[PDB]
């Protein structure tokens, strides 16, 4: 067993260069095509197999794809881990920055927090940071279009890198995409005597955005070859493992966002531990990682009743509450605040929130939903208090257990069906609570973006995997909006971009202004926009005009019936 | 001339067909208790221990033995290892702290974390602050109070199985007189037992590497209803009388909580229909509790002369006769025979699963076995092993007790101490 696999991988996929050329973070999955119309129980199993592909060693003899487990990969997770232990036994003038956008960047905010606890633990002083772009309040809001800003990344690393003499930036860009982590690793390689600059993302680096940057002389594919040219020299690395499609096309917060958590905490961990073989040390804590699927989705049955329940709420108008202890309320809030731009929800509908370290409770009304999320180790009388106050009725709890514990008499009166994870007893030394820590992180996000996925599909907003009724709030999303005109179409590249640029403008003129524009004009005025993406398709499917299938849609129950309508 | 007794005393009587059905519904949950699938759904839940044999430099015998009275706090070291001689070795590790007025007098919380403190300390200073050992707490919700001032506090965490049973201190302080042995065993008033699981059959754990002790709680057995039909009618009124209806139904069956009841029943059945006092049912006689089980231990031990038997009946204010006395030496005798016969059929299902976890055709073990109705029952302790190596052919089965002068969590500590001196 070249890899001791606990859970088996899923079987090898449709997944080669005939497929698609589009990049693989981009491309919808061969195993979604009809998640439009799956039931729960079905979509359960088919996000759980999604997410799975992550853990899934080399398929095909030939590598098409250089997957988690290829020796690749782990090698250069081991050389990274190489650079950060030199930094952690020289604190003094020493940091770590963790950085991305979006759920990138959150998932750098919940690494920072966490290995700052770590090194607290052992008396060390802290040296860790993230850099999320637009600053702490895109943690909790969505401010996508501020990552179109290479010089913002770098303005905000200059100021925390400030009197350092060693810092290692670590940017993470699930799709390869983000101006703002191109930017910081460009400014890197001009002075390698300081900074270490490390590239995370999920494509093969020939795939990675190569469309100017409005503010950089570089493309992020450029910017990433010359890297992988300096990790030749061991001055960069470059680490882009094929983890696959997300269940829901782009959705780059789910397996994108489980993936970015599991490689860093993984490498770091192991890092931290060691201070010489750590390539044993590495698989011991993928290993980890790996149960905590196999533990969430024996579930599954309880997560598809629970689907059903948060869904009912939301088609009957009603509004979903996310109450989480400690971390895992940071969790809760990371799901429901990117339910906005993924979806057409409305921030109220679902909201995280955090007790620990009486405005909403007197407000709640018997048609929302409140779930509770907490450990056996949290404090189950503050719980309680709320718990019993709360009859409304429409409730269920997630709590994550260690092996010997039970849950009260009391609170199983309350959640007659609770959702029960039981996780088996780690023996790492010191460690064992922090990677216990974040599996139960995992394990969480997991659980809720599955169930927020599931619930916003079972209403109809979808359209096989992809966000049909999208906002083009940012480039990225631009460029894939564009994509999923060409895909259903059909239709040459030409035709499509007219369209998208005639709906964004719209009720505006055609002009030679706007086609030869900055990709930077568009987003300021779209962002705002709706319905963009179902207009401009319904005015080419049927040779139509923007105004005939404005009318169209209203009289429709949905964007998303009248497309499938069309076609 | 009836003989009617003799039928009524078969309900008791149970057969070797009967007894491996058990052995096998035993191993059964007892399977499901270990697959992290099933494990909430089994009534014998088969926790593990902090007690494990692995590479990472754990051996069973490793231990952390706290102890308190008076103002002084003792932590003690156990360590198993190989000697210079590459022998089986052991050494030890003490330290004395002496614990503030304050704390002292003080309240329950304002201790414990002074004791979180003094552990903290012993165990920096031997390096050994994270190696996850066992735990036993000796005097002079406590397993509790000491966890919860660990995560108040930020130095390292235990989990809830690091405080040990009687069951498994009991294999350990067997352990290190015959290391052979790899299962512990209670039976007194309650009925529970211990053993070394390999690591790879226990999903519960994260590794696959070595073997784990396993507290079984095959108490719980039944609560499924895996026994109900070797269930009698005096079987079912305890449950329905106890405190803990529908549970711990394997553990009535043999608790010496409850073996002296299940006799009083089976008398009251006597007088009802058959020449049993007469039908003369006596004032304490229908008392509930008033048979306590240290009667049957009494009654056979009569040196058949009857006289035992007389004192004890001669206070529940019965004047027996040389007739129906006999009778009551037969009923004790049919409960205890089936009390030790329920108890070989458990022990025999673990056996036989560590033999088939095992390459060997021949399983030379050993047993640690400590309680009341085992070691000071006249005729249990025999009747149950003739049982078990029926049921386990090819297991050279060696029985060892917990000896004197050691309760728990101390017969461990003392019979380390006492192996120093080597
Ligand atoms: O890692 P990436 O590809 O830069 O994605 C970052 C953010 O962009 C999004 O795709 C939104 O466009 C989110 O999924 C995520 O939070
Ligand atoms: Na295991």
């Known amino acids: 067993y070249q890899h001791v696999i606990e859970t088996p991988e899923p079987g090898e996929w449709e997944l080669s260069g005939y497929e698609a050329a589009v990049p693989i973070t981009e491309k919808s999955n061969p195993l979604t095509r009809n998640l439009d119309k799956a039931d729960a129980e079905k979509i359960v199993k088919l996000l759980g197999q999604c997410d799975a592909e992550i853990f899934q060693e080399e398929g095909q003899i030939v590598p098409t794809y250089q997957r988690l487990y290829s020796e690749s990969v782990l090698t250069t997770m081991l050389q990274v881990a190489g650079k950060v232990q030199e930094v952690l036994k020289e604190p003094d003038g020493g940091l770590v920055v963790l950085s991305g956008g979006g759920t990138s960047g959150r998932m750098a905010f919940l690494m920072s927090v966490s290995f700052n606890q770590l090194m607290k633990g052992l008396g060390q002083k802290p040296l860790y940071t993230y850099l999320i772009a637009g600053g702490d309040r895109s943690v909790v809001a969505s401010r996508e279009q501020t990552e179109d800003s290479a010089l913002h990344g770098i303005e905000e690393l200059k100021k925390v890198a400030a009197g350092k003499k060693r810092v290692v930036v670590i940017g993470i860009s699930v799709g390869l995409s983000a101006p703002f982590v191109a930017g910081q690793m460009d400014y890197c390689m001009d002075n390698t005597a300081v900074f270490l600059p490390v590239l995370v993302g999920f494509n093969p680096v020939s795939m990675a955005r190569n469309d100017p940057i409005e503010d950089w002389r570089s493309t992020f594919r450029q910017v990433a070859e010359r890297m992988q040219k300096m990790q030749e020299k061991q001055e960069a690395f470059v680490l882009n493992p094929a983890i696959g499609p997300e269940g829901l096309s782009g959705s780059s917060r789910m397996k994108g966002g489980g993936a970015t958590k599991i490689l860093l905490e993984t490498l770091l961990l192991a890092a931290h531990k060691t201070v010489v073989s750590s390539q044993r040390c590495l698989l011991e804590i993928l290993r980890t990682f790996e149960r905590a699927h196999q533990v969430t989705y024996s579930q599954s049955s309880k997560i598809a009743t629970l689907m059903k329940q948060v869904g009912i709420s939301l088609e009957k108008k009603g509004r979903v509450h996310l109450v989480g202890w400690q971390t895992l309320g940071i969790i809760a809030i990371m799901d429901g605040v990117e339910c906005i731009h993924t979806f057409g929800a409305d921030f109220q509908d679902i909201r995280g929130f955090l007790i620990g370290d009486t405005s909403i409770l007197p407000s709640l009304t018997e048609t929302d939903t409140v779930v509770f999320i907490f450990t056996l180790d949290d404090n189950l009388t503050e719980v309680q208090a709320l718990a019993e106050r709360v009859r409304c009725q429409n409730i269920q709890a997630l709590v994550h257990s260690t092996v010997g514990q039970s849950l009260p008499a009391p609170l199983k009166k309350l959640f007659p069906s609770l959702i029960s994870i039981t996780w088996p007893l780690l023996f790492f030394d010191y460690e064992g609570t922090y990677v216990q820590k974040f599996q139960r992180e995992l394990s969480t996000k997991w659980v809720l973006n599955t169930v927020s996925t599931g619930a916003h599909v079972l209403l109809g907003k979808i359209l096989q995997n992809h966000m049909l009724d999208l906002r083009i709030a940012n480039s990225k999303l631009f460029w894939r909006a564009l994509a999923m005109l060409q895909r259903f179409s059909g239709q040459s590249k030409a035709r499509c971009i007219e369209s998208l640029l005639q709906a964004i403008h719209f009720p505006q003129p055609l002009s030679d202004d706007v086609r030869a524009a900055p990709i930077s004009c568009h987003v300021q005025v779209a962002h705002e926009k709706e319905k963009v993406i179902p207009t401009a398709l319904l005015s080419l499917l049927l040779r139509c005009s923007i105004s005939e299938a404005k009318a169209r849609l209203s009289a429709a129950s949905s964007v998303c019936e009248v497309v499938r309508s069309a076609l | ?422």
């Open chain 2, 1 to 422: 001339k009836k003989e009617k007794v003799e039928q009524i005393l078969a309900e008791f009587q149970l057969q070797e067909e009967d007894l491996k059905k058990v052995m096998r519904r035993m191993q059964k949950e007892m399977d499901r208790g270990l697959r992290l699938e099933t494990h909430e759904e089994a009534s014998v839940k088969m926790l593990p221990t902090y007690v494990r044999s692995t590479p990472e430099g754990s051996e069973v015998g490793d231990f952390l033995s706290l102890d308190l009275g008076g103002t002084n706090f003792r932590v003690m070291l156990v360590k198993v290892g190989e000697g210079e001689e590459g022998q089986w070795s052991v050494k030890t590790k003490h330290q004395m702290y002496s614990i503030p007025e304050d704390a002292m007098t003080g309240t329950a919380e304002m201790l414990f974390d002074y004791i979180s403190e003094c552990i903290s300390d012993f165990l920096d200073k031997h390096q050994m602050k994270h190696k996850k050992l066992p735990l036993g707490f000796t005097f002079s919700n406590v397993v509790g109070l000491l966890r919860d001032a660990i995560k108040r506090r930020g130095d390292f965490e235990m989990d809830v199985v690091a405080m040990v049973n009687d069951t498994v201190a009991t294999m350990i302080s067997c352990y290190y007189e015959d290391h052979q042995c790899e299962v512990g065993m209670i039976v007194g008033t309650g009925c529970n037992a211990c053993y070394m699981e390999e690591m790879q059959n226990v999903e519960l754990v994260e590794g696959d590497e070595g073997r784990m002790c396993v507290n079984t709680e095959w108490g719980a057995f039944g609560d499924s209803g895996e026994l109900d039909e070797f269930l009698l009618e005096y079987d079912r009124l305890v449950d329905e009388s106890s405190a803990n209806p529908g549970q711990q139904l394997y553990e009535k069956l043999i608790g010496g909580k409850y073996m002296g009841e299940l006799v009083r029943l089976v008398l009251l059945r006597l007088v009802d229909e058959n020449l049993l006092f007469h039908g003369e049912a006596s004032e304490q006689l229908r008392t509930r509790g008033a048979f306590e089980t240290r009667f049957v231990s009494q009654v056979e031990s009569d040196t058949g002369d009857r006289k035992q038997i007389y004192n004890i009946l001669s206070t529940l204010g019965l004047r027996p006769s040389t007739t129906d006395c006999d009778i009551v030496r037969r009923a004790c005798e049919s409960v205890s025979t089936r009390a030790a016969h329920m108890c070989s059929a458990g022990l025999a299902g673990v056996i036989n699963r560590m033999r088939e976890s095992r390459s060997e055709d021949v399983m030379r073990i050993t047993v640690g076995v400590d309680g009341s109705v085992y070691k000071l029952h006249p005729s249990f302790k025999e009747r149950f092993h003739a049982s078990v190596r029926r049921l386990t052919p090819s297991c050279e089965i060696t029985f060892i007790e917990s000896e004197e002068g050691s309760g728990r969590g101390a017969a461990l500590v003392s019979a380390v101490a006492c192996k120093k001196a080597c």
